[PDB]
């Protein structure tokens, strides 16, 4: 038996961050509050097909591996300097690819300049997924 | 120029 149909699903993941200079720096002494997030556009659900999101913070951070298993996939923190932040997105999925890794640029602005509101769109294609993962991907 | 210093 064989199939007469091919199916190709495209998903959009939004990753982004906000970064605000603190009024007073902490004892440590961090100068900014910032938050980094993974979400679907226009408040769409991605838990149907995302197993967990892994935020690899910089070494200088306590407990540098942060793991979110359920929405919101976000981390909130304070700091003094920007850095590359590899984000791993694991899928509710049988075969390759099981996860994918981005290098997210977590940058901060200086005092007297607006806060940071950065939004980045990444688009992935799953060519002929298994039927179960296709259902997870297009779930209402 | 609009950005802070960075880490390692």
Short mmCIF file of N, CA, C and O in Angstrom, two decimals:
data_model
loop_
_atom_site.label_atom_id
_atom_site.label_comp_id
_atom_site.label_asym_id
_atom_site.label_seq_id
_atom_site.Cartn_x
_atom_site.Cartn_y
_atom_site.Cartn_z
N UNK A 1 0.83 -1.20 0.00
CA UNK A 1 0.00 0.00 0.00
C UNK A 1 0.87 1.25 0.00
O UNK A 1 1.95 1.27 0.61
N UNK A 2 0.39 2.32 -0.65
CA UNK A 2 1.12 3.57 -0.64
C UNK A 2 0.16 4.76 -0.59
O UNK A 2 -1.07 4.62 -0.67
N UNK A 3 0.76 5.94 -0.43
CA UNK A 3 0.06 7.19 -0.22
C UNK A 3 0.15 8.07 -1.46
O UNK A 3 1.19 8.11 -2.13
N UNK A 4 -0.93 8.77 -1.75
CA UNK A 4 -0.98 9.71 -2.86
C UNK A 4 -0.81 11.14 -2.41
O UNK A 4 -0.91 12.05 -3.24
N UNK A 5 -0.56 11.37 -1.11
CA UNK A 5 -0.51 12.71 -0.54
C UNK A 5 0.76 12.95 0.25
O UNK A 5 1.29 12.05 0.91
N UNK A 6 1.28 14.18 0.14
CA UNK A 6 2.37 14.68 0.97
C UNK A 6 1.81 15.78 1.84
O UNK A 6 0.85 16.46 1.47
N UNK A 7 2.39 15.97 3.02
CA UNK A 7 1.96 17.05 3.90
C UNK A 7 3.17 17.75 4.49
O UNK A 7 4.11 17.10 4.94
N UNK A 8 3.13 19.08 4.49
CA UNK A 8 4.23 19.90 5.01
C UNK A 8 3.67 21.01 5.90
O UNK A 8 3.01 21.93 5.39
N UNK A 9 3.98 20.94 7.21
CA UNK A 9 3.48 21.89 8.21
C UNK A 9 4.55 22.94 8.50
O UNK A 9 5.72 22.60 8.72
N UNK A 10 4.14 24.21 8.54
CA UNK A 10 5.02 25.31 8.92
C UNK A 10 4.57 25.91 10.24
O UNK A 10 3.42 26.34 10.36
N UNK A 11 5.48 25.98 11.20
CA UNK A 11 5.20 26.61 12.49
C UNK A 11 6.03 27.89 12.64
O UNK A 11 7.18 27.97 12.18
N UNK A 12 5.42 28.90 13.25
CA UNK A 12 6.11 30.13 13.60
C UNK A 12 6.27 30.19 15.12
O UNK A 12 5.29 30.08 15.87
N UNK A 13 7.51 30.32 15.59
CA UNK A 13 7.80 30.58 16.99
C UNK A 13 8.30 32.02 17.13
O UNK A 13 9.20 32.43 16.38
N UNK A 14 7.71 32.78 18.04
CA UNK A 14 8.23 34.10 18.41
C UNK A 14 9.09 33.98 19.66
O UNK A 14 8.62 33.50 20.69
N UNK A 15 10.35 34.41 19.56
CA UNK A 15 11.20 34.57 20.72
C UNK A 15 11.54 36.05 20.88
O UNK A 15 11.73 36.74 19.88
N UNK A 16 11.65 36.53 22.12
CA UNK A 16 11.92 37.94 22.31
C UNK A 16 12.23 38.25 23.76
O UNK A 16 12.25 37.37 24.62
N UNK A 17 12.45 39.54 24.03
CA UNK A 17 12.80 39.94 25.39
C UNK A 17 12.53 41.42 25.59
O UNK A 17 12.45 42.19 24.62
N UNK A 18 12.34 41.79 26.87
CA UNK A 18 12.25 43.18 27.34
C UNK A 18 13.37 43.44 28.34
O UNK A 18 13.67 42.57 29.17
N UNK A 19 13.98 44.63 28.30
CA UNK A 19 15.06 44.94 29.23
C UNK A 19 14.98 46.39 29.70
O UNK A 19 15.10 47.33 28.91
N UNK A 20 14.83 46.54 31.02
CA UNK A 20 14.51 47.78 31.71
C UNK A 20 15.61 48.12 32.72
O UNK A 20 15.94 47.29 33.58
N UNK A 21 16.19 49.32 32.63
CA UNK A 21 17.13 49.77 33.67
C UNK A 21 16.41 49.96 34.99
O UNK A 21 15.43 50.71 35.08
N UNK A 22 16.91 49.30 36.05
CA UNK A 22 16.36 49.45 37.40
C UNK A 22 16.56 50.87 37.91
O UNK A 22 17.58 51.52 37.63
N UNK A 23 15.61 51.34 38.73
CA UNK A 23 15.81 52.61 39.44
C UNK A 23 17.06 52.55 40.31
O UNK A 23 17.97 53.37 40.17
N UNK A 24 17.13 51.55 41.20
CA UNK A 24 18.28 51.32 42.05
C UNK A 24 18.85 49.94 41.76
O UNK A 24 18.09 48.96 41.69
N UNK A 25 20.17 49.82 41.58
CA UNK A 25 20.75 48.49 41.34
C UNK A 25 20.76 47.65 42.60
O UNK A 25 20.82 48.16 43.72
N UNK A 26 20.71 46.34 42.41
CA UNK A 26 20.71 45.44 43.54
C UNK A 26 22.06 45.51 44.28
O UNK A 26 22.99 46.22 43.88
N UNK A 27 22.16 44.72 45.35
CA UNK A 27 23.42 44.59 46.08
C UNK A 27 24.50 43.90 45.27
O UNK A 27 25.68 43.98 45.63
N UNK A 28 24.13 43.25 44.16
CA UNK A 28 24.99 42.27 43.49
C UNK A 28 25.93 42.65 42.31
O UNK A 28 26.58 41.74 41.81
N UNK A 29 25.95 43.87 41.77
CA UNK A 29 24.84 44.79 41.74
C UNK A 29 24.33 44.81 40.30
O UNK A 29 25.00 45.32 39.38
N UNK A 30 23.16 44.21 40.11
CA UNK A 30 22.51 44.14 38.82
C UNK A 30 21.87 45.47 38.46
O UNK A 30 21.27 46.13 39.31
N UNK A 31 21.97 45.86 37.19
CA UNK A 31 21.44 47.15 36.77
C UNK A 31 20.15 47.07 35.97
O UNK A 31 19.55 48.12 35.69
N UNK A 32 19.72 45.88 35.55
CA UNK A 32 18.56 45.76 34.67
C UNK A 32 17.67 44.62 35.13
O UNK A 32 18.16 43.62 35.65
N UNK A 33 16.38 44.77 34.88
CA UNK A 33 15.45 43.65 34.87
C UNK A 33 15.10 43.32 33.42
O UNK A 33 14.85 44.22 32.61
N UNK A 34 15.09 42.04 33.09
CA UNK A 34 14.75 41.65 31.75
C UNK A 34 14.02 40.32 31.78
O UNK A 34 14.12 39.53 32.72
N UNK A 35 13.28 40.09 30.72
CA UNK A 35 12.53 38.86 30.61
C UNK A 35 12.68 38.39 29.17
O UNK A 35 12.63 39.21 28.25
N UNK A 36 12.92 37.08 29.01
CA UNK A 36 13.01 36.45 27.69
C UNK A 36 11.95 35.35 27.59
O UNK A 36 11.66 34.65 28.57
N UNK A 37 11.38 35.20 26.39
CA UNK A 37 10.19 34.37 26.23
C UNK A 37 10.17 33.69 24.86
O UNK A 37 10.73 34.19 23.88
N UNK A 38 9.47 32.56 24.83
CA UNK A 38 9.05 31.88 23.61
C UNK A 38 7.53 31.74 23.65
O UNK A 38 6.97 31.30 24.67
N UNK A 39 6.87 32.13 22.56
CA UNK A 39 5.41 32.16 22.44
C UNK A 39 5.05 32.00 20.97
O UNK A 39 5.88 32.21 20.10
N UNK A 40 3.80 31.62 20.69
CA UNK A 40 3.30 31.64 19.34
C UNK A 40 2.66 32.98 19.02
O UNK A 40 2.23 33.71 19.91
N UNK A 41 2.58 33.35 17.74
CA UNK A 41 2.07 34.68 17.41
C UNK A 41 0.58 34.79 17.73
O UNK A 41 -0.16 33.82 17.70
N UNK A 42 0.18 36.00 18.11
CA UNK A 42 -1.22 36.29 18.41
C UNK A 42 -1.80 35.30 19.42
O UNK A 42 -2.92 34.81 19.28
N UNK A 43 -1.00 35.01 20.46
CA UNK A 43 -1.44 34.27 21.65
C UNK A 43 -1.83 32.83 21.33
O UNK A 43 -2.63 32.21 22.03
N UNK A 44 -1.23 32.30 20.28
CA UNK A 44 -1.51 30.94 19.88
C UNK A 44 -0.83 29.95 20.82
O UNK A 44 0.23 30.21 21.37
N UNK A 45 -1.47 28.81 20.98
CA UNK A 45 -0.96 27.74 21.81
C UNK A 45 0.12 26.96 21.07
O UNK A 45 -0.08 26.54 19.92
N UNK A 46 1.27 26.76 21.71
CA UNK A 46 2.29 25.88 21.17
C UNK A 46 2.57 24.68 22.07
O UNK A 46 3.35 23.79 21.68
N UNK A 47 1.94 24.60 23.23
CA UNK A 47 2.10 23.44 24.10
C UNK A 47 1.58 22.16 23.44
O UNK A 47 2.04 21.05 23.77
N UNK A 48 0.63 22.28 22.51
CA UNK A 48 0.17 21.10 21.79
C UNK A 48 1.33 20.31 21.21
O UNK A 48 1.27 19.07 21.13
N UNK A 49 2.44 20.99 20.84
CA UNK A 49 3.56 20.29 20.23
C UNK A 49 4.92 20.58 20.84
O UNK A 49 5.91 19.96 20.42
N UNK A 50 5.02 21.47 21.82
CA UNK A 50 6.28 21.75 22.49
C UNK A 50 6.31 21.02 23.82
O UNK A 50 5.42 21.21 24.67
N UNK A 51 7.33 20.19 24.01
CA UNK A 51 7.49 19.40 25.23
C UNK A 51 8.06 20.24 26.37
O UNK A 51 7.52 20.21 27.48
N UNK A 52 9.14 20.98 26.10
CA UNK A 52 9.79 21.91 27.02
C UNK A 52 10.66 22.87 26.20
O UNK A 52 11.03 22.59 25.05
N UNK A 53 10.98 24.02 26.83
CA UNK A 53 11.92 25.02 26.33
C UNK A 53 13.05 25.18 27.33
O UNK A 53 12.82 25.36 28.53
N UNK A 54 14.28 25.15 26.84
CA UNK A 54 15.48 25.18 27.67
C UNK A 54 16.24 26.49 27.42
O UNK A 54 16.66 26.75 26.29
N UNK A 55 16.41 27.30 28.47
CA UNK A 55 17.13 28.58 28.41
C UNK A 55 18.50 28.43 29.06
O UNK A 55 18.60 28.31 30.29
N UNK A 56 19.55 28.44 28.24
CA UNK A 56 20.93 28.30 28.73
C UNK A 56 21.45 29.69 29.06
O UNK A 56 21.95 30.41 28.19
N UNK A 57 21.32 30.07 30.32
CA UNK A 57 21.84 31.36 30.74
C UNK A 57 23.38 31.35 30.75
O UNK A 57 24.02 30.29 30.68
N UNK A 58 23.96 32.54 30.84
CA UNK A 58 25.41 32.65 30.89
C UNK A 58 25.96 32.03 32.18
O UNK A 58 25.24 31.88 33.18
N UNK A 59 27.23 31.63 32.12
CA UNK A 59 27.87 30.97 33.25
C UNK A 59 27.72 31.77 34.53
O UNK A 59 27.42 31.20 35.59
N UNK A 60 27.87 33.09 34.44
CA UNK A 60 27.89 33.98 35.61
C UNK A 60 26.59 33.94 36.41
O UNK A 60 26.52 34.57 37.47
N UNK A 61 25.60 33.28 35.93
CA UNK A 61 24.28 33.15 36.53
C UNK A 61 24.20 31.89 37.38
O UNK A 61 24.70 30.84 36.98
N UNK A 62 23.61 32.03 38.57
CA UNK A 62 23.24 30.85 39.35
C UNK A 62 22.40 29.91 38.51
O UNK A 62 21.62 30.33 37.65
N UNK A 63 22.56 28.61 38.76
CA UNK A 63 21.67 27.59 38.21
C UNK A 63 21.48 27.81 36.71
O UNK A 63 20.35 28.01 36.24
N UNK A 64 22.56 27.81 35.92
CA UNK A 64 22.47 28.41 34.57
C UNK A 64 21.49 27.70 33.63
O UNK A 64 20.99 28.35 32.71
N UNK A 65 21.17 26.43 33.83
CA UNK A 65 20.20 25.74 32.97
C UNK A 65 18.81 25.98 33.55
O UNK A 65 18.50 25.52 34.66
N UNK A 66 17.98 26.74 32.83
CA UNK A 66 16.58 26.95 33.20
C UNK A 66 15.70 26.17 32.24
O UNK A 66 15.94 26.17 31.03
N UNK A 67 14.68 25.50 32.77
CA UNK A 67 13.83 24.61 31.99
C UNK A 67 12.37 24.99 32.27
O UNK A 67 11.96 25.06 33.43
N UNK A 68 11.62 25.29 31.20
CA UNK A 68 10.18 25.50 31.31
C UNK A 68 9.50 24.34 30.60
O UNK A 68 9.79 24.08 29.43
N UNK A 69 8.62 23.64 31.32
CA UNK A 69 7.87 22.53 30.75
C UNK A 69 6.46 22.92 30.33
O UNK A 69 5.83 22.15 29.59
N UNK A 70 5.96 24.09 30.73
CA UNK A 70 4.59 24.49 30.42
C UNK A 70 4.57 26.00 30.26
O UNK A 70 5.43 26.69 30.80
N UNK A 71 3.58 26.56 29.51
CA UNK A 71 3.50 28.02 29.33
C UNK A 71 3.34 28.77 30.63
O UNK A 71 2.94 28.19 31.61
N UNK A 72 3.71 30.05 30.67
CA UNK A 72 4.54 30.72 29.66
C UNK A 72 5.98 30.20 29.70
O UNK A 72 6.55 29.97 30.76
N UNK A 73 6.54 29.96 28.52
CA UNK A 73 7.96 29.61 28.43
C UNK A 73 8.78 30.89 28.56
O UNK A 73 9.15 31.51 27.57
N UNK A 74 9.06 31.31 29.80
CA UNK A 74 9.73 32.58 30.02
C UNK A 74 10.68 32.47 31.19
O UNK A 74 10.52 31.62 32.07
N UNK A 75 11.67 33.35 31.20
CA UNK A 75 12.56 33.53 32.34
C UNK A 75 12.66 35.02 32.62
O UNK A 75 12.73 35.83 31.69
N UNK A 76 12.62 35.38 33.92
CA UNK A 76 12.78 36.76 34.38
C UNK A 76 14.00 36.85 35.28
O UNK A 76 14.19 35.99 36.15
N UNK A 77 14.82 37.89 35.09
CA UNK A 77 16.09 37.96 35.79
C UNK A 77 16.55 39.40 35.82
O UNK A 77 15.95 40.28 35.20
N UNK A 78 17.67 39.63 36.54
CA UNK A 78 18.34 40.92 36.60
C UNK A 78 19.82 40.72 36.31
O UNK A 78 20.39 39.67 36.60
N UNK A 79 20.43 41.75 35.72
CA UNK A 79 21.80 41.58 35.27
C UNK A 79 22.50 42.90 35.04
O UNK A 79 21.95 43.98 35.27
N UNK A 80 23.74 42.80 34.57
CA UNK A 80 24.52 44.00 34.33
C UNK A 80 25.06 44.15 32.92
O UNK A 80 25.67 45.18 32.64
N UNK A 81 24.85 43.16 32.05
CA UNK A 81 25.49 43.10 30.74
C UNK A 81 24.75 42.07 29.89
O UNK A 81 24.16 41.14 30.42
N UNK A 82 24.78 42.26 28.55
CA UNK A 82 24.11 41.36 27.63
C UNK A 82 24.98 40.18 27.23
O UNK A 82 26.16 40.11 27.57
N UNK A 83 24.37 39.26 26.47
CA UNK A 83 25.04 37.99 26.19
C UNK A 83 24.22 37.14 25.21
O UNK A 83 23.01 37.35 25.01
N UNK A 84 24.90 36.15 24.62
CA UNK A 84 24.23 35.14 23.80
C UNK A 84 23.56 34.10 24.70
O UNK A 84 24.16 33.61 25.66
N UNK A 85 22.32 33.77 24.39
CA UNK A 85 21.48 32.91 25.22
C UNK A 85 20.93 31.79 24.36
O UNK A 85 19.94 32.00 23.63
N UNK A 86 21.56 30.62 24.34
CA UNK A 86 21.05 29.54 23.48
C UNK A 86 19.73 29.03 24.05
O UNK A 86 19.61 28.80 25.26
N UNK A 87 18.74 28.95 23.20
CA UNK A 87 17.43 28.47 23.58
C UNK A 87 17.19 27.16 22.86
O UNK A 87 17.48 27.05 21.66
N UNK A 88 16.75 26.14 23.58
CA UNK A 88 16.43 24.85 22.99
C UNK A 88 14.93 24.61 23.08
O UNK A 88 14.33 24.83 24.14
N UNK A 89 14.34 24.17 21.98
CA UNK A 89 12.91 23.90 21.92
C UNK A 89 12.73 22.43 21.53
O UNK A 89 13.09 22.01 20.42
N UNK A 90 12.20 21.65 22.48
CA UNK A 90 11.99 20.22 22.33
C UNK A 90 10.55 19.97 21.86
O UNK A 90 9.62 20.61 22.35
N UNK A 91 10.36 19.04 20.92
CA UNK A 91 9.02 18.80 20.36
C UNK A 91 8.43 17.47 20.82
O UNK A 91 9.14 16.47 20.97
N UNK A 92 7.09 17.46 21.01
CA UNK A 92 6.29 16.27 21.33
C UNK A 92 6.26 15.36 20.10
O UNK A 92 5.28 15.29 19.35
N UNK A 93 7.35 14.64 19.91
CA UNK A 93 7.74 14.20 18.59
C UNK A 93 8.48 12.88 18.69
O UNK A 93 9.20 12.63 19.66
N UNK A 94 8.30 12.04 17.67
CA UNK A 94 8.91 10.72 17.60
C UNK A 94 10.29 10.77 16.96
O UNK A 94 11.28 10.33 17.55
N UNK A 95 10.37 11.29 15.74
CA UNK A 95 11.61 11.23 14.99
C UNK A 95 12.31 12.59 14.94
O UNK A 95 11.86 13.58 15.54
N UNK A 96 13.43 12.63 14.22
CA UNK A 96 14.17 13.86 14.00
C UNK A 96 13.28 14.84 13.25
O UNK A 96 12.43 14.42 12.47
N UNK A 97 13.45 16.15 13.50
CA UNK A 97 14.34 16.64 14.54
C UNK A 97 13.59 16.67 15.87
O UNK A 97 12.41 17.03 15.87
N UNK A 98 14.25 16.26 16.95
CA UNK A 98 13.61 16.19 18.26
C UNK A 98 13.58 17.54 18.97
O UNK A 98 12.61 17.85 19.69
N UNK A 99 14.61 18.37 18.78
CA UNK A 99 14.68 19.72 19.31
C UNK A 99 15.30 20.61 18.25
O UNK A 99 15.72 20.13 17.20
N UNK A 100 15.34 21.92 18.52
CA UNK A 100 16.15 22.85 17.72
C UNK A 100 16.65 23.96 18.63
O UNK A 100 15.98 24.35 19.59
N UNK A 101 17.85 24.46 18.31
CA UNK A 101 18.61 25.40 19.12
C UNK A 101 18.76 26.72 18.38
O UNK A 101 19.16 26.75 17.21
N UNK A 102 18.47 27.82 19.08
CA UNK A 102 18.72 29.17 18.59
C UNK A 102 19.74 29.86 19.47
O UNK A 102 19.86 29.57 20.65
N UNK A 103 20.48 30.78 18.89
CA UNK A 103 21.30 31.71 19.66
C UNK A 103 20.52 33.02 19.75
O UNK A 103 20.40 33.74 18.75
N UNK A 104 19.95 33.30 20.91
CA UNK A 104 19.17 34.53 21.09
C UNK A 104 20.06 35.62 21.66
O UNK A 104 20.79 35.40 22.62
N UNK A 105 20.01 36.81 21.06
CA UNK A 105 20.88 37.90 21.52
C UNK A 105 20.16 38.71 22.58
O UNK A 105 19.33 39.58 22.27
N UNK A 106 20.51 38.47 23.85
CA UNK A 106 19.89 39.18 24.95
C UNK A 106 20.70 40.42 25.25
O UNK A 106 21.65 40.40 26.05
N UNK A 107 20.32 41.52 24.61
CA UNK A 107 21.05 42.77 24.79
C UNK A 107 20.27 43.73 25.68
O UNK A 107 19.04 43.63 25.80
N UNK A 108 20.99 44.66 26.29
CA UNK A 108 20.42 45.67 27.17
C UNK A 108 20.73 47.06 26.62
O UNK A 108 21.79 47.27 26.01
N UNK A 109 19.83 48.02 26.86
CA UNK A 109 20.08 49.42 26.53
C UNK A 109 20.60 50.20 27.74
O UNK A 109 20.39 49.82 28.90
N UNK A 110 21.27 51.32 27.47
CA UNK A 110 21.83 52.13 28.53
C UNK A 110 20.79 53.10 29.10
O UNK A 110 19.75 53.38 28.49
N UNK A 111 21.12 53.65 30.27
CA UNK A 111 20.27 54.61 30.96
C UNK A 111 19.96 55.82 30.08
O UNK A 111 20.79 56.29 29.30
N UNK A 112 18.73 56.34 30.25
CA UNK A 112 18.25 57.45 29.45
C UNK A 112 17.77 57.08 28.06
O UNK A 112 17.27 57.95 27.33
N UNK A 113 17.92 55.83 27.65
CA UNK A 113 17.36 55.36 26.40
C UNK A 113 16.15 54.48 26.66
O UNK A 113 16.06 53.87 27.73
N UNK A 114 15.20 54.41 25.73
CA UNK A 114 13.99 53.60 25.96
C UNK A 114 14.36 52.21 26.44
O UNK A 114 15.51 51.77 26.28
N UNK A 115 13.44 51.50 27.07
CA UNK A 115 13.68 50.08 27.37
C UNK A 115 13.70 49.28 26.07
O UNK A 115 13.41 49.78 24.98
N UNK A 116 14.05 47.99 26.21
CA UNK A 116 14.21 47.09 25.07
C UNK A 116 12.97 46.24 24.91
O UNK A 116 12.57 45.53 25.85
N UNK A 117 12.40 46.24 23.70
CA UNK A 117 11.22 45.42 23.40
C UNK A 117 11.48 44.74 22.05
O UNK A 117 11.07 45.22 21.00
N UNK A 118 12.16 43.59 22.09
CA UNK A 118 12.60 42.93 20.88
C UNK A 118 11.81 41.65 20.62
O UNK A 118 11.61 40.83 21.53
N UNK A 119 11.39 41.48 19.37
CA UNK A 119 10.55 40.38 18.95
C UNK A 119 11.20 39.77 17.71
O UNK A 119 11.52 40.49 16.77
N UNK A 120 11.41 38.46 17.73
CA UNK A 120 12.12 37.76 16.67
C UNK A 120 11.26 36.60 16.20
O UNK A 120 10.74 35.84 17.02
N UNK A 121 11.09 36.46 14.90
CA UNK A 121 10.23 35.43 14.37
C UNK A 121 11.10 34.36 13.74
O UNK A 121 11.98 34.67 12.92
N UNK A 122 10.90 33.12 14.14
CA UNK A 122 11.59 31.99 13.56
C UNK A 122 10.54 31.06 12.96
O UNK A 122 9.46 30.88 13.53
N UNK A 123 10.84 30.48 11.81
CA UNK A 123 9.87 29.66 11.11
C UNK A 123 10.49 28.31 10.79
O UNK A 123 11.60 28.23 10.28
N UNK A 124 9.78 27.24 11.15
CA UNK A 124 10.26 25.88 10.96
C UNK A 124 9.30 25.08 10.10
O UNK A 124 8.08 25.31 10.12
N UNK A 125 9.86 24.14 9.35
CA UNK A 125 9.08 23.28 8.47
C UNK A 125 9.27 21.82 8.87
O UNK A 125 10.41 21.34 8.92
N UNK A 126 8.17 21.14 9.16
CA UNK A 126 8.13 19.68 9.32
C UNK A 126 7.50 19.06 8.07
O UNK A 126 6.28 19.16 7.86
N UNK A 127 8.36 18.39 7.27
CA UNK A 127 8.00 17.69 6.04
C UNK A 127 7.46 16.29 6.34
O UNK A 127 8.22 15.41 6.77
N UNK A 128 6.18 16.08 6.08
CA UNK A 128 5.52 14.79 6.25
C UNK A 128 5.75 14.20 7.65
O UNK A 128 6.32 13.12 7.80
N UNK A 129 5.29 14.89 8.69
CA UNK A 129 5.49 14.37 10.04
C UNK A 129 4.69 13.10 10.19
O UNK A 129 3.80 12.81 9.39
N UNK A 130 4.97 12.36 11.27
CA UNK A 130 4.08 11.29 11.65
C UNK A 130 2.69 11.86 11.86
O UNK A 130 2.52 13.07 12.10
N UNK A 131 1.68 10.99 11.74
CA UNK A 131 0.29 11.41 11.91
C UNK A 131 0.04 11.98 13.31
O UNK A 131 -0.69 12.97 13.46
N UNK A 132 0.67 11.40 14.33
CA UNK A 132 0.45 11.87 15.70
C UNK A 132 1.03 13.26 15.90
O UNK A 132 0.40 14.13 16.50
N UNK A 133 2.24 13.47 15.38
CA UNK A 133 2.84 14.79 15.50
C UNK A 133 2.16 15.80 14.59
O UNK A 133 2.19 17.00 14.88
N UNK A 134 1.57 15.36 13.48
CA UNK A 134 0.80 16.29 12.66
C UNK A 134 -0.45 16.74 13.41
O UNK A 134 -0.86 17.92 13.32
N UNK A 135 -1.05 15.83 14.18
CA UNK A 135 -2.21 16.18 14.98
C UNK A 135 -1.82 17.13 16.10
O UNK A 135 -2.49 18.15 16.33
N UNK A 136 -0.73 16.82 16.81
CA UNK A 136 -0.23 17.77 17.80
C UNK A 136 0.04 19.13 17.16
O UNK A 136 -0.25 20.16 17.77
N UNK A 137 0.55 19.16 15.93
CA UNK A 137 0.94 20.46 15.35
C UNK A 137 -0.27 21.31 14.97
O UNK A 137 -0.24 22.54 15.13
N UNK A 138 -1.33 20.70 14.45
CA UNK A 138 -2.45 21.50 13.97
C UNK A 138 -3.64 21.51 14.93
O UNK A 138 -4.70 22.03 14.56
N UNK A 139 -3.49 20.95 16.14
CA UNK A 139 -4.53 21.00 17.17
C UNK A 139 -5.11 22.40 17.33
O UNK A 139 -4.37 23.40 17.39
N UNK A 140 -6.43 22.47 17.45
CA UNK A 140 -7.16 23.72 17.61
C UNK A 140 -6.79 24.40 18.92
O UNK A 140 -7.56 25.19 19.46
N UNK B 1 26.35 50.86 20.04
CA UNK B 1 26.38 52.22 20.59
C UNK B 1 25.18 52.42 21.54
O UNK B 1 25.33 52.99 22.61
N UNK B 2 24.00 51.93 21.16
CA UNK B 2 22.84 52.04 22.02
C UNK B 2 22.82 50.96 23.10
O UNK B 2 21.94 50.96 23.97
N UNK B 3 23.78 50.06 23.10
CA UNK B 3 23.73 48.87 23.88
C UNK B 3 24.73 48.96 25.01
O UNK B 3 25.58 49.78 24.93
N UNK B 4 24.60 48.12 26.04
CA UNK B 4 25.52 48.07 27.17
C UNK B 4 26.80 47.34 26.79
O UNK B 4 26.99 46.89 25.66
N UNK B 5 27.65 47.15 27.78
CA UNK B 5 28.69 46.15 27.62
C UNK B 5 28.09 44.74 27.66
O UNK B 5 26.96 44.51 28.11
N UNK B 6 28.88 43.78 27.18
CA UNK B 6 28.47 42.38 27.19
C UNK B 6 29.31 41.51 28.10
O UNK B 6 30.33 41.96 28.61
N UNK B 7 28.91 40.26 28.30
CA UNK B 7 29.71 39.38 29.07
C UNK B 7 30.62 38.59 28.18
O UNK B 7 30.72 38.86 26.94
N UNK B 8 31.28 37.59 28.77
CA UNK B 8 32.19 36.72 28.04
C UNK B 8 31.51 36.04 26.85
O UNK B 8 32.03 36.07 25.74
#
